[PDB]
Amino acid sequence: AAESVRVAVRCRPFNQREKDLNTTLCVGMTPNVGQVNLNAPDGAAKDFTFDGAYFMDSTGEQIYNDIVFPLVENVIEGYNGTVFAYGQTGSGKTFSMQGIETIPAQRGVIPRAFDHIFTATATTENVKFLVHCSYLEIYNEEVRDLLGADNKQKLEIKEQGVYVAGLSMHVCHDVPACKELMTRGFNNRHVDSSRSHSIFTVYVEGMTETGSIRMGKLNLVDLAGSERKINLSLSALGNVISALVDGHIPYRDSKLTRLLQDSLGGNTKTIMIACVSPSSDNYDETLSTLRYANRAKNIKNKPTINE
Ligand SMILES: Nc1ncnc2c1ncn2[C@@H]1O[C@H](COP(=O)(O)OP(=O)(O)O)[C@@H](O)[C@H]1O
Ligand SMILES: [Mg+2]
């Protein structure tokens, strides 16, 4: 079925220095209708409509429940699903994807997708599920396996769909197995993470009582900071989105757009979490993220059940 990319905006709270400077709040929201207003110094507001609008006190729990939970349900049924985190360095991309364990309601979409997948796969008595994970990093157009034996090894992108040749896949029989791969991946990151893209993939294979196998993959992507060969994957993402909404798509311009070409206009249900700052000192970057997120709503995907 024809389905548009769902876009949600998340505004982080002020940090300590912003409070010490008494920094002006230039972001407003009307979460019932997904409205985000951005105020300029002169007083003129710029208004945007999104599929979700999560303000300074929002939690990873309420973001997951409203926006990601139905996509993860679809992955279990056999669909491909992708969640990207987009925004400047310091806006909350990693806090939205990974989150924190010190405050349970602030746990990210990745730990939450693990709990959801292992709960839902066990409560479906008709289907037997096998879960596998992969975790890669793209820095300077160099693709690296974050869980492999040699993490330094640069890997090639080939097509059979599109895949990373030599990318290790790790069986996960439960949530602890999943969380060990997350910390393992973190300790193997390039030396900090602001200029690279990371992709955590969860493969959910379901075997029915008949014997029919369905295969849905979940891509959880933490993009490099959008602040204005290092910036090629980000520039190509913008160029791809422009072609997709402008009515040829240059997926091959970068490693990131080649790998995720099915997430942008292909067989996948995609969600974009655009992260913004509440501060008037970040106005220019926030306006850039909001315009990018607004444009991203017009991308048309064609997700079908992989069975
Ligand atoms: N919603 C939030 N609530 C509390 N702290 C947050 C929130 N979003 C981000 N932070 C804090 O802001 C800082 C930067 O966030 P981070 O996720 O690392 O951003 P990014 O990955 O986009 O560079 C961190 O110190 C993090 O704890
Ligand atoms: Mg980060």
Numbering used by the authors: 1 to 160, 164 to 194, 202 to 238, 254 to 272, 276 to 335
Paper text:
OSM‐3 belongs to the homodimeric kinesin‐2 subfamily and is the Caenorhabditis elegans homologue of human KIF17. Similar to KIF17, OSM‐3 is involved in intraflagellar transport in the distal part of the cilium, and both proteins are autoinhibited at the resting state. We have determined the structure of the motor domain of OSM‐3 either bound to ADP or to AMPPNP, or devoid of a nucleotide.
The best crystal diffracted X‐rays up to 2.1 Å resolution and was used in the analysis presented below. Although ATP was included in the purification buffer, ADP was found in the OSM‐3 nucleotide‐binding site, as is common with purified kinesins. Accordingly, the region from Arg238 to Lys254, which encompasses the C‐terminal part of the Switch 2‐containing L11 loop and the N‐terminal part of the neighboring α4 helix, is disordered. In addition, the L9 loop of ADP‐OSM‐3 is poorly ordered, with residues 195–201 unable to be built in the model, similar to, for example, the kinesin‐10 NOD but in contrast to the helical conformation found in other ADP‐kinesin structures. As this loop comprises the Switch 1 motif and is part of the nucleotide‐binding site, this observation agrees with a lower involvement of Switch 1 in the binding of ADP than of ATP. Another characteristic of ADP‐OSM‐3 is that the neck linker is docked onto the core motor domain, the ‘docked’ state being a feature of microtubule‐bound ATP‐kinesins. In the case of ADP‐OSM‐3, the movement of α4 might be facilitated because the two loops (L11 and L12) flanking α4 are mobile in this structure. In OSM‐3, this residue (Asn334) interacts with Asn80 and Asn295, similarly to what is observed in kinesin‐1. To sum up, the ADP‐OSM‐3 motor domain shows a standard structure of ADP‐kinesins.
